Amino acid sequence: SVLTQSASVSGSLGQSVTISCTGPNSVCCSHKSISWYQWPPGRAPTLIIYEDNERAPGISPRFSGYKSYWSAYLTISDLRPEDETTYYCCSYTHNSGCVFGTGTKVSVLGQSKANPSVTLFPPSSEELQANKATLVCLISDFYPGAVTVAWKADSSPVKAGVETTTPSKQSNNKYAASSYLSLTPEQWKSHRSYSCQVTHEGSTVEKTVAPTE
Amino acid sequence: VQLQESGPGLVRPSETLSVTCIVSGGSISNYYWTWIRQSPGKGLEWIGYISDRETTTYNPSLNSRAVISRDTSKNQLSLQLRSVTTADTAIYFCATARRGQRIYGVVSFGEFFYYYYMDVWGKGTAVTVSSASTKGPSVFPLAPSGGTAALGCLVKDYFPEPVTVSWNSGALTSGVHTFPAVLQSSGLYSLSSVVTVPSSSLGTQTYICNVNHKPSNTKVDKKVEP
Amino acid sequence: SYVSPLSVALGETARISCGRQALGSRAVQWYQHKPGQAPILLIYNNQDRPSGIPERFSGTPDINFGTTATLTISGVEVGDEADYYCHMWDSRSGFSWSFGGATRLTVLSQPKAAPSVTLFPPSSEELQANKATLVCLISDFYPGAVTVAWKADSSPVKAGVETTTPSKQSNNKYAASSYLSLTPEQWKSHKSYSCQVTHEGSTVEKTVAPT
Amino acid sequence: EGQLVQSGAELKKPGASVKISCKTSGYRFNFYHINWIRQTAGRGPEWMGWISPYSGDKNLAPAFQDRVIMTTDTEVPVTSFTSTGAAYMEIRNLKFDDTGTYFCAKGLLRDGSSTWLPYLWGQGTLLTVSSASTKGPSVFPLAPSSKSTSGGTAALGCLVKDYFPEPVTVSWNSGALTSGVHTFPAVLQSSGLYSLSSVVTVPSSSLGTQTYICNVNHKPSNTKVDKRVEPKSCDKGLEV
Amino acid sequence: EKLWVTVYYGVPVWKEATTTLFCASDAKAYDTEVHNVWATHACVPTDPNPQEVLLENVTEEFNMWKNSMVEQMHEDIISLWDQSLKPCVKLTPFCVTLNCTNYGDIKQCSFNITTEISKRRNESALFSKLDLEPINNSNTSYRLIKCNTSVIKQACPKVSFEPIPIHYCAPAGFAILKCNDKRFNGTGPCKNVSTVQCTHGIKPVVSTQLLLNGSLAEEEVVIRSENLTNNAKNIIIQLNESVVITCERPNNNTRKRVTLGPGKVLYTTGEIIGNIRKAHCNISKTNWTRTLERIVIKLREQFKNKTIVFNQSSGGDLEIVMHVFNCGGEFFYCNTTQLFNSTYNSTTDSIITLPCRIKQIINRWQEVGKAMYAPPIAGQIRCQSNITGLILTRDGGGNGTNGTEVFRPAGGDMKDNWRSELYKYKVVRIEPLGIAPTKCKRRVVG
Amino acid sequence: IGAVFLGFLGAAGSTMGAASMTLTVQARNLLSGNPDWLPDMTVWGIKQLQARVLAVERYLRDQQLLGIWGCSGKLICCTNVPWNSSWSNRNLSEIWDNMTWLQWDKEISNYTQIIYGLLEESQNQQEKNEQDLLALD
Ligand SMILES: *[C@@H]1O[C@H](CO)[C@@H](O[C@@H]2O[C@H](CO)[C@@H](O[C@@H]3O[C@H](CO[C@H]4O[C@H](CO)[C@@H](O)[C@H](O[C@H]5O[C@H](CO)[C@@H](O)[C@H](O)[C@@H]5O)[C@@H]4O)[C@@H](O)[C@H](O[C@H]4O[C@H](CO)[C@@H](O)[C@H](O)[C@@H]4O[C@H]4O[C@H](CO)[C@@H](O)[C@H](O)[C@@H]4O)[C@@H]3O)[C@H](O)[C@H]2NC(C)=O)[C@H](O)[C@H]1NC(C)=O
Ligand SMILES: *[C@@H]1O[C@H](CO)[C@@H](O[C@@H]2O[C@H](CO)[C@@H](O[C@@H]3O[C@H](CO[C@H]4O[C@H](CO)[C@@H](O)[C@H](O)[C@@H]4O)[C@@H](O)[C@H](O[C@H]4O[C@H](CO)[C@@H](O)[C@H](O)[C@@H]4O)[C@@H]3O)[C@H](O)[C@H]2NC(C)=O)[C@H](O)[C@H]1NC(C)=O
Ligand SMILES: *[C@@H]1O[C@H](CO)[C@@H](O[C@@H]2O[C@H](CO)[C@@H](O[C@@H]3O[C@H](CO)[C@@H](O)[C@H](O[C@H]4O[C@H](CO)[C@@H](O)[C@H](O)[C@@H]4O)[C@@H]3O)[C@H](O)[C@H]2NC(C)=O)[C@H](O)[C@H]1NC(C)=O
Ligand SMILES: *[C@@H]1O[C@H](CO)[C@@H](O[C@@H]2O[C@H](CO)[C@@H](O[C@@H]3O[C@H](CO)[C@@H](O)[C@H](O)[C@@H]3O)[C@H](O)[C@H]2NC(C)=O)[C@H](O)[C@H]1NC(C)=O
Ligand SMILES: *[C@@H]1O[C@H](CO)[C@@H](O[C@@H]2O[C@H](CO)[C@@H](O[C@@H]3O[C@H](CO)[C@@H](O)[C@H](O)[C@@H]3O)[C@H](O)[C@H]2NC(C)=O)[C@H](O)[C@H]1NC(C)=O
Ligand SMILES: *[C@@H]1O[C@H](CO)[C@@H](O[C@@H]2O[C@H](CO)[C@@H](O)[C@H](O)[C@H]2NC(C)=O)[C@H](O)[C@H]1NC(C)=O
Ligand SMILES: *[C@@H]1O[C@H](CO)[C@@H](O[C@@H]2O[C@H](CO)[C@@H](O)[C@H](O)[C@H]2NC(C)=O)[C@H](O)[C@H]1NC(C)=O
Ligand SMILES: *[C@@H]1O[C@H](CO)[C@@H](O[C@@H]2O[C@H](CO)[C@@H](O)[C@H](O)[C@H]2NC(C)=O)[C@H](O)[C@H]1NC(C)=O
Ligand SMILES: *OC[C@H]1O[C@@H](*)[C@H](NC(C)=O)[C@@H](O)[C@@H]1O
Ligand SMILES: *[C@@H]1O[C@H](CO)[C@@H](O)[C@H](O)[C@H]1NC(C)=O
Ligand SMILES: *[C@@H]1O[C@H](CO)[C@@H](O)[C@H](O)[C@H]1NC(C)=O
Ligand SMILES: *[C@@H]1O[C@H](CO)[C@@H](O)[C@H](O)[C@H]1NC(C)=O
Ligand SMILES: *[C@@H]1O[C@H](CO)[C@@H](O)[C@H](O)[C@H]1NC(C)=O
Ligand SMILES: *[C@@H]1O[C@H](CO)[C@@H](O)[C@H](O)[C@H]1NC(C)=O
Ligand SMILES: *[C@@H]1O[C@H](CO)[C@@H](O)[C@H](O)[C@H]1NC(C)=O
Ligand SMILES: *[C@@H]1O[C@H](CO)[C@@H](O)[C@H](O)[C@H]1NC(C)=O
Ligand SMILES: *[C@@H]1O[C@H](CO)[C@@H](O)[C@H](O)[C@H]1NC(C)=O
Ligand SMILES: *[C@@H]1O[C@H](CO)[C@@H](O)[C@H](O)[C@H]1NC(C)=O
Ligand SMILES: *[C@@H]1O[C@H](CO)[C@@H](O)[C@H](O)[C@H]1NC(C)=O
Ligand SMILES: *[C@@H]1O[C@H](CO)[C@@H](O)[C@H](O)[C@H]1NC(C)=O
Ligand SMILES: *[C@@H]1O[C@H](CO)[C@@H](O)[C@H](O)[C@H]1NC(C)=O
């Protein structure tokens, strides 16, 4: 897309943050209105800013817009946990449709830490009956937008059949993720225990299941 | 169709009249037939009629004294009138009856009516209601100049209504005149029938008058000669 | 009784009105009746003519107009002298058993005709039957007036005469018959008897004698 | 103050066509432009076009000008100021890069310099373009596991596996159980099969008074699975 | 950011209400016919150009069963009938005993008049069977049916009973909303709305059962009802194609003017010239069967696919079971057996002819009281009307439910005839005062 | 600004702003509705004349309100009464470019009497006090 926004921007809790939106003069803002949208992934967006400064109905006064002759800006004051999401700008006129920007991901610094919740599930007897085995390591309630997952067979790493998902944001502004380990019934029965290790930059948690019990 | 009547010629008071009507040229089963009479000094009075279903309807002025019947085996229509008086003396005609429909609106609403019209008639038959008896007529020859002579038969003293007079059947039809009857003070009747004949045909040709008096039992021929 | 008479000049148009006026839509028949003959259906359905009936006769159509049933005879002839019955049917009177009272049609102004007189003396059989009747036959006279007188020789006989009333015959001419009944001694008493006929025309007579 | 409900998710082979509907309610459908916007992983959010229910005038982006046909029905009035309507978008010549989520969106103002601006958005319709067929999912029970021994809480759920069509919905007790439900996103296996898991947290003492039934739906394969989660756990921490 | 209220006078805002409308009609001179009561002496001069304005983007809710124009029109036809019968002659002295004989319902009746004009007058007039009832029951004596219930007044001979177009207008500050939707249900929201000052030319055709000389619904026929599942409410139907009904009184009646006294004149039915033919109405069976087939197609739209039977009326008095209407001055009562004698399931012409009796004394709109004697009309009668609607009624309680459905004709109220032509109009009051905030303030006083 | 005339109530479905400029159309026909000649009252004019007087009684009632609000001769006039957010929480562009006068009256219907009380008291009843004080000296 020719409408470029700042790839990333960060602000502290209770502070303000500014997102940029600019491009060539063919899409520029001197003769085009600029609008801003809050677009959480996997959900419907919400209009926050239209016709430059004028904000949408019901929008809090924390949001403000400003448009220069070379770029436009969106200012979010008094940052909240829910403001930490993806934002898009668009350039439009009255007869021509919307031209979305590249997108900007906002990170709110200065938030409290939230301990991770790990839960490991073994394969069901009906699944072992179907001759497959899948260990499910579910992880929720995350303070940072990142995890690292490792699997171990009898305290030794595993590398075949590991599939880990990307972190996803919870409705309570926390994060969540999951990992799956596919195994054959021989590998499952020939070991004393399996382990799912979730590593964070502040603390590493380990959960262990055993085929014996 | 051809119709011809036949009757008694005389009925006594308080007796039963009876006339018959022979039809020809048409089947009796597919038509309506009716009877009408005319008395002296009166008009045509409709007696009644019979249908193809052999059902009969009568004028109430006849007071149920009349009855009309069919006989297909002899193709004849019949009529009886019981308990006659002198007023029932009349010439009785038989006729064919056709039924027409005069519609002035909706058939279901009864906005129509029927009417009968007689299209074929009979010459009628003379019937008299009298106590006395039928008297046969004594007939005499009136014997026979402009090239022609007069030749007559005198039919004298017959009691009831008509008398048939013929002359050599069909040969003498060109110049024959049968005069109307005279009523004598005695109640007897008399008529005369004359023919105009070439005088040269006298002495060579023959002429007889056939006098039929059907009401009485009678039949006479009279050869007239100079 | 009195019925109805009508007089029409020869050759003109006679119109015979119906004795009844229909209360509703009508069906009228016109009949013709001559003395001593069978009646004839002239008109049925008020306007329909049977085959053989001359077109000189006509009735009035029922066109819902206020017109009475009328029989029209154009160019009347002496052969049209008869009684004409108007059989009237309509929707409000019911079954009409009555033929109504016809009106006798008299056609006038035909040529006057001289009467033929034939006088027959008593038959020899009648004389030997102890009776005697002189027959005077008058025929072929068109005018209506008549008079027959009898004379025993030169004196006029007053009794014993019985004369028919004249009536038209099959040649449209009138005919009458006069009978003078005598006894055989009265017949042979006088030298001659005579039938003298009187007719708005001239004196006419014939004479017989015992021989 | 109105709701826009779009048609369900579909799966169409590349080269075929598909018609998406968008039924509206709660406002005058004749008064606001209906916009169509899609989002794919390769090109991000991309505005496709809009159509006017009042005049029928349509404006399509040149990238979708030859493959998108937009139509609208007539508004079925409800009250003096509200009505119900429907808008349709038929897209043809589908390719693999067209797989994504589509949205219908109500305009902003009746008059002004920005009338068509997408304001009220639908829930979204998932469109999958692939030559692979539809595969029905398999459901397995997730036995209860301890969450807090001192707190007396446990977690149980149901595991869904091997399904190609991504649209999958899970409910509990026919929608009567909504509190404590946690549904996890699906995983993309190397074979091209998608699988997820769902878990609910309940007090461990609730074993003899409440029934727990997980209802798995799958509109593409048209398969429903009602699994009863066995409440007897094997976790020693929960056995105590 | 400072919002101040601002007054606006003339805002398009209206509210439902009921007001008092007024007559509107063309000004036909009619010099030969002295001011018929529906054309009046001078009600208004109608506007040369009728003016209607489509109100685009406006939806509004209509309800023909809670309308006030129907209650107004009903009270106006009743009041107009009473104001037209006051100056006419009242038949108070006619109730003298009548010696009657047959002319067959039509009967002749001799009587002795009590005048003031020399003491008494013998007269005999042609009276129908419905107008009279015997007392001795030995056919010796008769009387008017009304002489034991209420008074009677003869209708004036100059006024004509012909319905003419009447427009209902709203006064200043009011407006009439006209729904123009083709498939418009009886009640509900109408998408197309246009305002008018006056309604269309509505003819006050007072009829029973079938609706005459009305307006035809556009495109498909319409089935309107307050409740279709509840039987007790009538069913009004409006066809798209109008059938033709030709009624006739073939009797060439005659009028005989009879003087009561000073000024009072009674018009008696003279002896009938011509034949006696009862009144009848031809209705084409082909276009009636076609119309009957288009009605059942839409009746089933609310009763499964196939369940329907057509019977005749079986409730009420003679004035409700029969198709009562006016034509030429005489009021006809027609037997409607052959029209409602059918059975349809599973989804040659012989023009149908109905028998019609005649009544000269009437009590319309269920009026118990002042009664009107319709004077006899001289000459034969022939009218051709466009039957445009019907009024049906279910039988109700059914064990089989969908097994069979049966629709009988009825006319429980006369207001149904006004509802069949007032379904599309509605009265509202314009409220021109609207206050809305803007960023404008009046000149400060300080 | 719109120069197209649509007739009486022709701007009912349009926005409030598009209709706020054509108030002279609904003001002429609001008062003028007279049956000029040819009227006889027989269960008609009693109802007809009252309907004509009830129109001018409500008309003069509206002019009485505009009289005590200081806008007797103007269709458009601005006041001193501030806008309370409890009445409606919509912005300026949300009211004059999105809603109609019909649906706007339904939203503020609950507070019409409250605003009418402040319109005849907060300003005109109090601005006439300072108006007497400005032209006092
Ligand atoms: C509702 O619909 C119904 C039907 O669907 C309508 O009914 C019509 O009503 C009118 C008025 O009452 C009827 O008119 C009458 O018709 C009589 C019949 O005669 C002629 O019509 C029929 C057709 O109906 C033809 O078939 C006849 O011709 C054929 O039949 C005769 C007899 O077998 C044959 O001889 C012929 O060769 C044909 O094969 C006839 O043409 C009629 O008698 C009647 O009376 C007179 O009225 C007029 C006006 O003066 C005359 O033109 C008519 O001819 C009649 O005149 C008299 O003289 C004629 C000879 O000149 C004779 O025939 C009679 O003596 C006759 O009395 C009248 O015309 C009509 O028939 C009827 N139609 C049907 C199909 O039933 C209703 O009117 C309608 N409702 C309304 C309100 O209109
Ligand atoms: C009945 O109900 C509907 C509401 O659903 C209304 O329809 C709306 O009408 C308004 C007013 O006309 C429209 O708002 C206008 O938007 C236009 C944008 O359209 C451009 O592109 C389309 C392609 O879809 C073309 O058809 C069109 O010609 C345009 O090119 C603007 O052009 C309008 O004004 C703009 O330009 C002028 C100067 O040119 C500026 O002054 C304006 O500020 C603005 O920038 C206007 O904004 C709205 O789009 C319609 N919506 C729908 C869904 O149809 C009816 O108006 C309403 N009432 C009546 C009486 O019909
Ligand atoms: C409308 O038109 C219809 C169609 O003709 C018409 O209906 C007819 O009514 C008469 C009057 O009752 C019926 O005549 C009946 O005929 C039967 C034999 O066919 C008799 O048994 C009847 O007598 C019994 O019933 C009477 C009434 O209950 C009793 O009073 C009586 O003592 C006997 O118990 C009776 O004579 C005629 O049959 C019908 N028509 C048809 C086709 O059946 C109707 O009158 C017209 N008017 C309306 C409905 O207002
Ligand atoms: C009231 O009573 C009088 C009593 O006389 C009735 O008058 C009489 O009416 C009849 C006919 O109904 C007349 O008879 C015939 O009238 C015809 C008509 O053309 C005429 O042609 C006949 O010569 C005959 O007169 C009768 O003359 C007449 N009375 C007198 C004295 O003339 C009258 O009809 C009765 N009216 C009612 C309505 O009962
Ligand atoms: C049933 O309804 C139809 C629908 O209108 C009627 O059709 C119309 O009928 C009339 C009378 O038969 C037709 O008029 C005739 O037109 C022809 C020429 O087209 C002319 O020669 C005749 O003299 C007569 O004027 C008319 O054309 C016809 N219309 C159509 C579109 O067909 C029909 O008559 C009704 N039939 C019955 C029995 O109710
Ligand atoms: C109805 O009755 C009237 C009254 O008689 C009829 O009118 C008269 O008809 C006759 C028929 O020849 C005319 O001579 C008259 O001029 C007509 N008028 C008057 C005042 O006498 C009329 O014809 C009848 N016709 C119908 C169809 O009912
Ligand atoms: C009722 O009217 C009739 C008719 O005038 C009176 O009696 C009739 O008298 C005529 C005289 O010829 C008879 O032909 C009728 O048969 C009589 N009527 C009946 C029914 O037989 C009768 O006296 C009158 N009665 C009253 C009470 O007015
Ligand atoms: C005016 O305000 C009243 C008070 O809130 C509203 O009446 C209530 O409306 C709610 C729903 O909006 C109902 O649940 C209540 O039962 C109503 N009554 C009460 C006493 O609360 C009313 O709807 C408002 N009217 C308008 C036009 O806004
Ligand atoms: O829906 C009933 C019936 O109504 C009349 C319509 N005809 C026309 C010309 O509109 C019929 O097609 C329809 O079946
Ligand atoms: C009037 O009264 C007389 C006197 O009894 C009576 O004969 C007659 O029938 C009554 N009616 C008429 C019409 O004369
Ligand atoms: C009047 O006559 C009618 C005829 O049936 C009768 O029903 C009614 O009861 C009578 N009036 C009174 C008050 O009874
Ligand atoms: C709607 O209104 C237009 C113009 O006002 C008219 O042409 C059309 O026929 C109407 N349609 C309906 C269904 O009312
Ligand atoms: C038409 O109106 C009737 C009466 O209000 C209602 O019962 C019926 O459901 C309506 N039609 C439809 C299709 O809903
Ligand atoms: C009709 O009446 C029934 C019974 O009271 C009721 O249930 C139904 O809602 C009514 N329908 C209409 C359209 O009035
Ligand atoms: C009604 O029609 C529908 C659709 O054709 C059909 O499925 C149903 O069986 C029909 N019912 C009856 C009773 O005919
Ligand atoms: C219905 O009409 C038929 C002729 O179509 C007839 O035979 C039958 O008697 C009628 N039924 C009734 C109840 O009138
Ligand atoms: C439908 O009506 C016809 C006509 O009488 C009849 O023959 C047939 O049996 C009926 N069918 C059903 C299913 O009622
Ligand atoms: C009545 O029907 C006739 C015949 O189709 C037609 O010419 C006429 O315009 C119709 N009039 C009304 C008012 O329906
Ligand atoms: C209704 O039907 C039931 C059986 O279906 C029967 O027992 C009952 O008697 C019926 N009721 C009537 C009123 O016919
Ligand atoms: C009514 O529905 C029943 C089903 O219970 C069916 O058997 C019957 O045929 C239906 N009646 C009809 C189609 O007339
Ligand atoms: C039709 O009429 C007959 C006889 O009066 C009756 O038994 C039957 O119930 C009626 N049917 C309907 C549907 O009215």
Author numbering:
A (entry chain E): 2 to 214
B (entry chain H): 2 to 82, 82A, 82B, 82C, 83 to 100, 100A, 100B, 100C, ...
C (entry chain L): 4 to 8, 11 to 66, 66A, 66B, 66C, 67 to 95, 95A, 95B, ...
D (entry chain D): 1 to 52, 52A, 53 to 72, 72A, 72B, 72C, 72D, 72E, ...
E (entry chain G): 32 to 134, 152 to 165, 168C, 168D, 169 to 308, 311 to 321, 321A, 322 to 355, ...
F (entry chain B): 515 to 549, 563 to 664
Quote the study on this structure.
The cleaved, mature Env is presented on HIV-1 virions as a metastable trimer of heterodimers each containing a (co-)receptor-binding protein, gp120, and a transmembrane protein, gp41, which anchors the Env spike within the viral membrane and drives the fusion process during cell entry. The envelope glycoprotein (Env) of HIV-1 harbors the epitopes of all broadly neutralizing antibodies (bNAbs) (1) and is the main target of vaccine design (2). However, it was not until recently that the primary cause of Env metastability—an HR1 bend (residues 547 to 569) in gp41ECTO—was identified and targeted directly by rational redesign. We then demonstrated that gp41ECTO is the main source of metastability by replacing WT gp41ECTO with BG505 gp41ECTO of the UFO design for 10 Envs across clades A, B, C, B/C, and A/E. The gp41ECTO-swapped trimers (termed UFO-BG) exhibited substantial yield and purity and were structurally validated by negative-stain EM.
The clade B H078.14 gp140 construct was selected for crystallization screening, as the trimer structure for a tier 3 neutralization-resistant isolate had yet to be determined. A crystal structure was determined for the H078.14 UFO-BG trimer (tier 3, clade B) at a resolution of 4.6 Å, which explains how this neutralization-resistant virus evades apex bNAbs and enables antigenic optimization of this UFO-BG trimer. Crystallographic analysis at this moderate resolution thus confirmed that BG505 gp41ECTO of the UFO design, with a minimal level of metastability, can be used to stabilize diverse HIV-1 Envs in a prefusion state, in addition to providing the first structural model for a tier 3 neutralization-resistant Env spike. Notably, trimers derived from clade B 6240.08.TA5.4622 and H078.14 were poorly recognized by apex-directed bNAbs while shielding the immunodominant V3 and gp41 epitopes more effectively than trimers of other clades. However, it is imperative to first determine the cause of poor bNAb binding to the V2 apex, which appeared to be inconsistent with the native-like prefusion trimer conformation. Specifically, the inward-facing Q170 and V172 in BG505 are now replaced with charged bulky residues R170 and E172 in H078.14. The additional glycan at N171 may have little effect on apex bNAb binding as it points sideways in the crystal structure (left). Our analysis thus confirmed that H078.14 can evade apex bNAbs through mutations in strand C and surrounding loops.
